[PDB]
Amino acid sequence: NSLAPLRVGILGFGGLGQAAARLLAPKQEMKLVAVADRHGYLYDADGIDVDNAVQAYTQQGSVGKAKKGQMSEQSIEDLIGEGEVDGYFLALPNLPNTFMADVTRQFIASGWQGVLVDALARTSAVEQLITLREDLAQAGITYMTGCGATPGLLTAAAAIASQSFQEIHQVKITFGVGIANWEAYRATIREDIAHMPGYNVDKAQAMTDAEVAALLDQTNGILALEDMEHADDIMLELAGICHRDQVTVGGVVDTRNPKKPLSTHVKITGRTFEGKISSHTFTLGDETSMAANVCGPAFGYLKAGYGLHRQGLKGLFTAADVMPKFVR
Amino acid sequence: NSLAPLRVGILGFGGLGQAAARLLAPKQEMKLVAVADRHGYLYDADGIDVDNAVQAYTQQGSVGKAKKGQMSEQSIEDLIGEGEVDGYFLALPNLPNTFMADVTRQFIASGWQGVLVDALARTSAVEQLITLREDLAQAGITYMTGCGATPGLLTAAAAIASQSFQEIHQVKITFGVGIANWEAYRATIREDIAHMPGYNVDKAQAMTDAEVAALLDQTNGILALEDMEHADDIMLELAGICHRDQVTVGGVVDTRNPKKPLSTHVKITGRTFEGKISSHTFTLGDETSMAANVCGPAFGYLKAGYGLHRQGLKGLFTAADVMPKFVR
Ligand SMILES: C[C@H](N)[C@@H](CCCCCC(=O)O)CC(=O)O
Ligand SMILES: C[C@H](N)[C@@H](CCCCCC(=O)O)CC(=O)O
Numbered sequence: 001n002s003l004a005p006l007r008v009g010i011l012g013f014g015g016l017g018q019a020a021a022r023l024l025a026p027k028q029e030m031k032l033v034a035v036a037d038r039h040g041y042l043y044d045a046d047g048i049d050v051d052n053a054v055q056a057y058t059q060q061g062s063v064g065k066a067k068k069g070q071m072s073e074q075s076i077e078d079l080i081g082e083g084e085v086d087g088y089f090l091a092l093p094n095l096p097n098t099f100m101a102d103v104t105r106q107f108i109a110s111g112w113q114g115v116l117v118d119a120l121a122r123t124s125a126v127e128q129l130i131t132l133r134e135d136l137a138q139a140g141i142t143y144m145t146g147c148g149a150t151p152g153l154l155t156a157a158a159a160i161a162s163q164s165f166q167e168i169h170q171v172k173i174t175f176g177v178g179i180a181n182w183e184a185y186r187a188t189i190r191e192d193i194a195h196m197p198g199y200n201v202d203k204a205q206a207m208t209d210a211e212v213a214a215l216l217d218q219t220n221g222i223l224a225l226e227d228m229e230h231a232d233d234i235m236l237e238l239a240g241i242c243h244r245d246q247v248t249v250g251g252v253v254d255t256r257n258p259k260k261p262l263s264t265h266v267k268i269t270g271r272t273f274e275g276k277i278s279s280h281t282f283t284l285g286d287e288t289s290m291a292a293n294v295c296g297p298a299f300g301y302l303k304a305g306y307g308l309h310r311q312g313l314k315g316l317f318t319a320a321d322v323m324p325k326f327v328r
Numbered sequence: 329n330s331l332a333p334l335r336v337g338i339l340g341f342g343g344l345g346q347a348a349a350r351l352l353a354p355k356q357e358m359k360l361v362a363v364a365d366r367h368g369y370l371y372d373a374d375g376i377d378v379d380n381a382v383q384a385y386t387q388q389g390s391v392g393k394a395k396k397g398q399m400s401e402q403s404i405e406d407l408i409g410e411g412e413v414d415g416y417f418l419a420l421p422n423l424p425n426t427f428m429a430d431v432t433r434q435f436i437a438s439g440w441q442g443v444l445v446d447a448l449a450r451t452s453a454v455e456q457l458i459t460l461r462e463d464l465a466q467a468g469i470t471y472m473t474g475c476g477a478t479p480g481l482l483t484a485a486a487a488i489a490s491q492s493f494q495e496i497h498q499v500k501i502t503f504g505v506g507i508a509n510w511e512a513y514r515a516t517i518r519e520d521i522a523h524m525p526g527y528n529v530d531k532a533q534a535m536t537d538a539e540v541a542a543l544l545d546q547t548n549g550i551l552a553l554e555d556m557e558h559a560d561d562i563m564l565e566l567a568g569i570c571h572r573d574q575v576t577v578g579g580v581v582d583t584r585n586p587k588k589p590l591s592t593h594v595k596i597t598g599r600t601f602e603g604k605i606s607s608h609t610f611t612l613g614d615e616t617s618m619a620a621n622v623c624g625p626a627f628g629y630l631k632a633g634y635g636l637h638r639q640g641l642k643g644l645f646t647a648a649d650v651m652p653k654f655v656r
Contacts, residue, residue, distance in 0.1 A: 023601040026494060156488045156651070157610065163481060163628040163652050164616045166354060241654045272620035273351040278613030282485065285606030288492045292600035300491040311639070323484070323651045324491050326569045 001029040006306060007045070008299070009034030009088040011076060011103065013057050015184030016119070017091035019291035020298065021050045029328050030299060034085050040064015041075040043083045058183070076103060080110045087115030087302045089295075093188055094125045097201050101128035104143070108132070113140030115305035119148025119294050121191065123244070126151075126231035129316060137315035142308050144317050147301035149293035150175060150249060151232045152319045154266040156297075157282040158232075159239055159320045164280065165270030168242040172267045173232060175251030177290045180258035186212075192253060195225040221256030239320035260286050264293070300324030329357040334634060335373070336627070337362030337416040339404060339431065341385050343512030344447070345419035347619035348626065349378045357656050358627060362413050368392015369403040371411045386511070404431060408438045415443030415630045417623075421516055422453045425529050429456035432471070436460070441468030443633035447476025447622050449519065451572070454479075454559035457644060465643035470636050472645050475629035477621035478503060478577060479560045480647045482594040484625075485610040486560075487567055487648045492608065493598030496570040500595045501560060503579030505618045508586035514540075520581060523553040549584030567648035588614050592621070628652030 006029065010017045013035055024032040032048045035041065040062035042053055049067070056066035064071035072078045088107075094100045100120055107116060120126055129145050136143050146152055150173050158171045179185045189212065194204035196215075207215075216223075228251070233244035254261040265283040272278065284293060303325040305317065334357065338345045341363055352360040360376045363369065368390035370381055377395070384394035392399035400406045416435075422428045428448055435444060448454055457473050464471050474480055478501050486499045507513045517540065522532035524543075535543075544551075556579070561572035582589040593611040600606065612621060631653040633645065 019601075023494070026601070153488065153491060157485060159651060159654070160481065160484045160488060161610070162654055163625040164612070164621050165624065166351070168654075239654065240656060272616055272624070273347075273354070274617055274620060276615040276617070276620075278615035280610070280612050280616070282489070282608070282610045284492070284608050287604040287606035288600055288608070289602055289604070292602060292604075293492050296493065296600070297491040311641070313639070321651060323487060323649060326487070326490055326496075326567065328568060 005029050005031040006303065007031055007033045007084055007086045008302065009036070009079065009083070009085045010091050011036050011088055012091035012093065013037040013053070013063055014091070014093065014187045015181070016188065016291065016294060018054055018057070018184070020089055020091055020295040021048065021053065023295045023299065025050055027327055030303070034079055034083050035063050036075040036079045037062050038075065039073065040069055040071040041079040042066050042069045043079065044068055045084065076106055080107065080112050085114065087117065087306060089298050089302060090116060090118040093191055094120060094122065095191065095201065095205050097122065097125055098128065100125055101132065104129060104132060107141060108135050108139045115142045115144065115302055115309050117144040117147050117298050117302045117305060119152060119298055120146050120231055121151070123229050123231045123234050126234055133316045140314055142305045142314050142317065144301040144305040146231045146235055147298050147319045147324070149290065149297065151230065151235055153293055153297045154282065155232045155235050155319045156324070158236060158266050158268050159241060161268040161280040161282065162241045162270065164272060166273045168246060168268065168270040169277070170267070170269040171232070171236060171242060171247045173249040174262065175264040176260040176262035177251065177253040178257045178259045178261060179253065179255045185255070189255070192223055192225065195228045196223065216255055221254060222261070223253045223255065225252070226250040235318040235320045238318060241320070297324055299327050303327050333357050333359040334631065335359055335361045335412055335414045336630065337364070337407065337411070337413045338419050339364050339416055340419035340421065341365040341381070341391055342419070342421065342515045343509070344516065344619065344622060346382055346385070346512070348417055348419055348623040349376065349381065351623045351627065353378055355655055358631070362407055362411050362416070363391050364403040364407045365390050366403065367401065368397055368399040369407040370394050370397045371407065372396055373412065404434055408435065408440050413442065415445065415634060417626050417630060418444060418446040421519055422448060422450065423519065423529065423533050425450065425453055426456065428453055429460065432457060432460060435469060436463050436467045443470045443472065443630055443637050445472040445475050445626050445630045445633060447480060447626055448474050448559055449479070451557050451559045451562050454562055461644045468642055470633045470642050470645065472629040472633040474559045474563055475626050475647045475652070477618065477625065479558065479563055481621055481625045482610065483560045483563050483647045484652070486564060486594050486596050487569060489596040489608040489610065490569045490598065492600060494601045496574060496596065496598040497605070498595070498597040499560070499564060499570060499575045501577040502590065503592040504588040504590035505579065505581040506585045506587045506589060507581065507583045513583070517583070520551055520553065523556045524551065544583055549582060550589070551581045551583065553580070554578040563646040563648045566646060569648070625652055627655050631655050
């Protein structure tokens with residue numbers, strides 16, 4: 001596959017998409033050929049120049065401003081029809097809550113076939129993609145949903161851990177995030193503030209940077225989120241592991257420190273066939289960033305998705321359903 | 329599937345096979361219809377009476393002595409041709425080191441198609457099954473190898489954990505086992521003593537219970553095993569995650585205490601795309617027995633294997649390659 005690498009694209013070029021591009025750079029079996037943001041796109045069948053695209057984006061507002069870039073207010077539509085791309089990572093803020101589904105309906109409408117991957121967080125966003133299962137399948141698209149850190153990595157770990165038990169009692173995810181680069185987080189931070197007490201997507205999305213800084217001042221830069229609406233729950237339910245109500249997700253983001261404020265882990269509790277109650281724990285290393293734990297799994301699921309696609313398996317899959325494949 | 333459960337069988341009815349039978353009892357989507365040991369077999373398309381089979385085995389030396397049992401010195405051959413069985417768990421001591429492969433060659437020769445699962449430990453035993461890949465595929469058999477605790481559960485956890493990293497440095501497995509029931513462990517204990525310093529399969533297999541008790545007396549019932557030949561290594565290599573030399577397996581079995589002498593875990597170390605070195609850790613609950621952590625995953629892989637089989641996917645798969653499916 002070093003002779004014929006998987007040709008991939010990234011939609012959305014905020015902090016996560018940019019990290020995704022950097023992660024792809026040293027891969028030999030995967031090549032980044034396509035990036036789109038809201039106001040432009042960049043295609044390069046020979047492989048994207050990541051430094052140039054990042055410069056363009058951060059200094060001129062869009063990758064359409066990069067060498068070989070194209071400005072466009074229909075960048076996704078234009079990009080889909082421009083290039084030979086085997087799969088895309090949808091690194092798109094789900095703002096509003098319908099956006100990911102709407103982008104997916106454009107892939108469907110386009111006639112394009114291949115693999116799509118997302119790192120959606122919200123159960124209700126994942127439910128919108130579930131409504132599209134047959135449309136995806138009929139379109140010839142293998143869609144990998146919730147394939148980030150959580151849902152994703154931690155969800156798959158819980159699916160594996162569950163095999164020791166006759167019955168599952170609880171899957172509890174606690175995450176920590178330290179923000180190293182403010183620019184890389186603003187434009188997703190409202191997605192998180194929406195999980196705050198007395199907030200929601202519409203309210204958070206409409207906040208000014210002034211109002212955000214004010215909220216953060218109160219809690220010293222810390223967003224402690226409990227019992228989040230998080231698609232891990234329906235994913236583990238669709239995989240037959242447990243009911244969604246037995247899955248709980250919470251976490252802490254420290255907007256003022258690059259160090260994780262706590263060690264991310266998932267605890268899986270259940271009863272074994274011998275009637276013993278016990279828990280497995282999967283814990284992430286403190287020096288693995290949000291970016292690595294989201295984008296790493298995302299492309300491992302893209303690779304896995306492609307394997308499925310190449311076997312004629314189309315439709316919607318979750319992180320809980322298949323083994324991601326290590327990308328080299 | 330409660331109307332048409334997967335009909336499964338177990339070959340070998342020492343401690344692990346017996347535990348496997350008990351684990352299957354409450355399942356509604358999987359039904360134990362077939363058990364064989366060296367000197368007899370038991371088939372019952374309506375579902376095995378586990379208490380009766382265990383009584384027969386432990387009190388009369390074979391399940392062939394159970395109500396509906398048949399004595400036979402070709403029990404595997406006879407069983408394969410007797411019943412409608414969708415998949416078998418091969419709960420067989422690999423003694424000698426060629427035995428599992430030889431049983432597998434009988435399934436091949438028989439014309440039977442379906443799923444086979446094992447919980448093999450040794451790299452060299454797994455390599456013998458790798459030589460049979462095409463024979464398996466041509467025979468219409470989906471073979472799931474190394475699908476126990478380690479290899480198996482812990483190997484799959486390492487495969488998932490690896491997705492955060494650009495390069496893997498080390499996968500380190502440390503296991504603990506407390507023996508609760510001596511009868512349930514003797515007849516596999518020689519497999520472990522073979523990993524001892526200054527021992528091997530042939531030497532260990534030829535030891536008398538006298539000589540075993542003597543060895544154990546020296547170390548107070550404790551078998552501390554380091555750098556074991558363990559198939560986790562080639563499995564993670566075949567899945568493209570790391571070289572076999574970066575996988576190390578050790579553990580402790582306490583023959584004199586039902587409590588685990590240490591907490592079983594796997595530590596996965598690597599470098600992320602940002603150049604940070606870090607480790608994830610997956611730890612098992614102390615009250616999850618060897619039996620639960622081996623047999624639970626084994627049947628989850630059988631179920632997964634069947635899914636593959638039903639899609640026309642035949643040949644050899646490892647725990648590292650696919651997501652096991654929770655059996656209810
Ligand atoms: C709050 C985040 N946006 C996200 C979780 C990131 C988990 C990272 C795990 C780690 O790197 O340890 C959850 C969310 O967006 O709801
Ligand atoms: C020594 C064992 N036979 C076996 C490991 C059992 C791991 C159980 C894990 C747990 O229950 O914590 C390894 C071996 O046989 O080589």
